[PDB]
Design a protein around this ligand. Sequence first.
Ligand SMILES: [Mn+2]
Ligand SMILES: [Mn+2]
Ligand SMILES: [Mn+2]
Ligand SMILES: [Mn+2]
Lengths: 313, 313
Amino acid sequence: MKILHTSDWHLGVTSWTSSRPVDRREELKKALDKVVEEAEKREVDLILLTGDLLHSRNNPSVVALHDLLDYLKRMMRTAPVVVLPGNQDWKGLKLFGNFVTSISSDITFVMSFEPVDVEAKRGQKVRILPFPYPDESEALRKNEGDFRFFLESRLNKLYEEALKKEDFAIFMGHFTVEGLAGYAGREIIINRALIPSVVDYAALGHIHSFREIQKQPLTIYPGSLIRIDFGEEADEKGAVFVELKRGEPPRYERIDASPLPLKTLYYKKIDTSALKSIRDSCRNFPGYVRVVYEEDSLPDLMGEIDNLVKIER
Amino acid sequence: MKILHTSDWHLGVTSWTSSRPVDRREELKKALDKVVEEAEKREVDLILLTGDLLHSRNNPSVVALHDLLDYLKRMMRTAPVVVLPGNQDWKGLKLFGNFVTSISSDITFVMSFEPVDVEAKRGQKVRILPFPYPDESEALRKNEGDFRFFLESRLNKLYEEALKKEDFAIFMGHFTVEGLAGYAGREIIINRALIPSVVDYAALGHIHSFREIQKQPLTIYPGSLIRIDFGEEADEKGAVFVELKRGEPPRYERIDASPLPLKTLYYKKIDTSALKSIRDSCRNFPGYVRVVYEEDSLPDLMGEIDNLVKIER
Ligand SMILES: [Mn+2]
Ligand SMILES: [Mn+2]
Ligand SMILES: [Mn+2]
Ligand SMILES: [Mn+2]
């Protein structure tokens, strides 16, 4: 069974609004078009979207919605799709996915801990074990003091249920795993060993950097399709194609999104030398630049350099 | 060759000072004593400390220094030690390590990109390829606009130098790798593929969660020995014992620090029910508790519950 797993699109995002608005819509469409064109070529059987498809939790734009629906539609033409909305998907979208989910067997939204069964392109019977974002807000809501005895009982249920799979069991989560603190300088974090060990694949979303979290069960974050801000100069962007065969270990292959790069320039004083360096370093750079400096002054660089998006102290 | 790799001790830390000071010194000594006692038992050949041994960058306490020196001394009695101070080690410590480094062949500090050679307990000839923290401050200092063409030239040098090893080449770094953003809601991050592939082991520090970053070359963060604040409820603490043999793939084994646990309780309103839940949930818990709630009021819980260290909204 062939799978396209992709995530964390953030449709409608514009970066650096406090300093120099760049609408990411063109770059983002470039990547999504590349991903979808790739999934058509490989003739995948199932498409897994693990959330944060939209960027605005409360006020998505019509353009953004139109886009998302366009893509959902192109994808459905190639294979059945399963969506696990995340923390930053507009609440209205969960309502629509709930409505469209009854109407079709070619798209299906999962918004609870309840497992659902689905058929893929070629009839493969797939069991979805979903784990939506553990929101601090819905732990205050539930008013159960220790939230963890509860998440743990859910991860147990999904394990008991994965054991009854017919063809494949696939876990879908939207959260952060016990990654890496302390980056300088809060979430309900889930330990990766807690993801049920018996599923054939564990598709994650929420993290923007592609990472192969563990091998048994195969657990991946595909990452964003673009670099959203400057904490993402060094990671990898794209989606992931996964193959599952009953007798065998899972195999996978990245589709790199080929995102525009980001770069930071560091200076003590903005000298005449610095000005030259900044001008020279931005001139032929195909992406976006931030400069940070230590000692004060300062000319209008952003009026002169189209790709200089941030200047700090 | 047998190695003890341990890191990120944070000697002298007291947690939750803004809300309920807990001096971590006792718990921390418990762990360090366990680690060192373990390294004596296994009779390791080399000890690698990858930085952030002290907690205070500018104002470490005498007690903290006394402690650090005690441990450095016990360790030297069992095997030669190599230290890569990190971002949060007091500047005075770098001065001392620089001074003590000439005087002895049983301890050696590495504070630049310059490789140094060392002998282990039993004569094994080891090549250290160090990579100290890429501080934003020392990139403003250097005043070289694009810092990355520079770090890259250094990682190249260390690779060219690892190829001339006699017995073992070992990389020591103090930084964050392209981990996982966006955790809700800056550093010079280094991509793990950039760590020279030819070294036999790559010892990292700065990250508090034990993680096996990659297998070839074997790259580990051992993690803290304690859980510093509440962003570390789910990760693992301890040190790492590593074995390297010329013909063979590297092998390793964690020493769990057995740290005191942390826990968050979530409530809508602090009711009479909540009060009961909080009281019941803290009563027999061997670690530290934080409660967060949504709607306002509120009694003196911290006067009544010794292990309740934080209350938010
Ligand atoms: Mn998310
Ligand atoms: Mn996201
Ligand atoms: Mn550090
Ligand atoms: Mn640290």
